[PDB]
Design a protein around this ligand. Structure first.
Ligand SMILES: CNCc1cccc(Cl)c1
Length: 281
């Protein structure tokens, strides 16, 4: 059981060591499309690339590339698209992907500015009466409503395909209180946020996969889909303590490199799952 595994690693301070075994065991697949010179300005970080086998393809004949990966967790019946925070030049591609994949929710785990630098383009409207038009992908985005709470904001957005005049409602779940350095002290507000995303229907199989991002789409984004998947597995299995968080992480790393960036994020993931396990129990 992971509660006991937690105490062992914690009392022995072995988090950096566990984390290095995961780094060592992790899959390595080609990412040739990401490294093409025509895609250099579609990547926020030169060392964070989608694998060719799991990459999301845009339906535009010109250049189908976006820094985004489909993570398919077969046993849990959960899919996620993990992507980087959009760049000034990829905001149109981002919304095209949301449209093409029939996503119902976008989960954002960063602030636009952190540590005095921009981590993400402002890719949604700030006011009802000032909609955004993405001329390159022929989409219009309107803010419908905004519910600001202490730890997160939920926004209802309307996405309109200007080509076909179809409209969809998108929910934007913005976790606003992840600290600039390290991880939250307590996983309580992160769990509350994760249960709010679940309650919306955004993670349900009747929609396309949820889009999850932070700045690179590997660290905080990783923690989100690791916690969700592990809790769902502990609710599906005969024996919930058969769920090994290290195994689940390695399965997710087949689909996108580098998920969980630090030993601190790994510790936090255990804590979130343990406490989320305490919940529902
Ligand atoms: C939802 N996962 C928590 C858990 C742990 C152990 C047993 C059950 Cl039914 C659920």
């Amino acid at each position: 059981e992971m509660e006991k595994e937690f105490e062992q690693i914690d009392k022995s301070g072995s988090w950096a060591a566990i984390y290095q075994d995961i780094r060592h065991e992790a899959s390595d697949f080609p990412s040739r499309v990401a490294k093409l010179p025509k895609n250099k300005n579609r990547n926020r970080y030169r060392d964070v690339s989608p694998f060719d086998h799991s990459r999301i393809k845009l339906h535009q004949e010109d250049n189908d590339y976006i820094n985004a990966s489909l993570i398919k967790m077969e046993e849990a019946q959960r899919s996620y698209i993990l992507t980087q925070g959009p760049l000034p030049n990829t905001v149109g591609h981002f919304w095209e992907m949301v449209w093409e994949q029939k996503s119902r929710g976008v989960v954002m785990l960063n602030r636009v500015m952190e540590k005095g630098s921009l981590k993400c383009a402002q890719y949604w409207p700030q006011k009802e009466e000032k909609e955004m038009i993405f001329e390159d992908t022929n989409l219009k985005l309107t803010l419908i409503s905004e519910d600001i709470k202490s730890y997160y904001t939920v926004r209802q957005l309307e996405l309109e395909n200007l080509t076909t005049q179809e409209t969809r409602e998108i929910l934007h779940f913005h976790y606003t209180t992840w600290p600039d350095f390290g991880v939250p002290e307590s996983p309580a507000s992160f769990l509350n946020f994760l249960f709010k995303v679940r309650e919306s229907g955004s993670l349900s199989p009747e929609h396309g996969p949820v889009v999850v991002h932070c700045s690179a789409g590997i660290g905080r984004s990783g923690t989100f889909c690791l916690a969700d998947t592990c809790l769902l597995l502990m609710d599906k299995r005969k024996d919930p303590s058969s769920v090994d968080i290290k195994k689940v992480l390695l399965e997710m790393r087949k689909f996108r490199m580098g998920l969980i960036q630090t030993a601190d994020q790994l510790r936090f993931s255990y804590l979130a799952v343990i406490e989320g396990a305490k919940f529902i129990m």
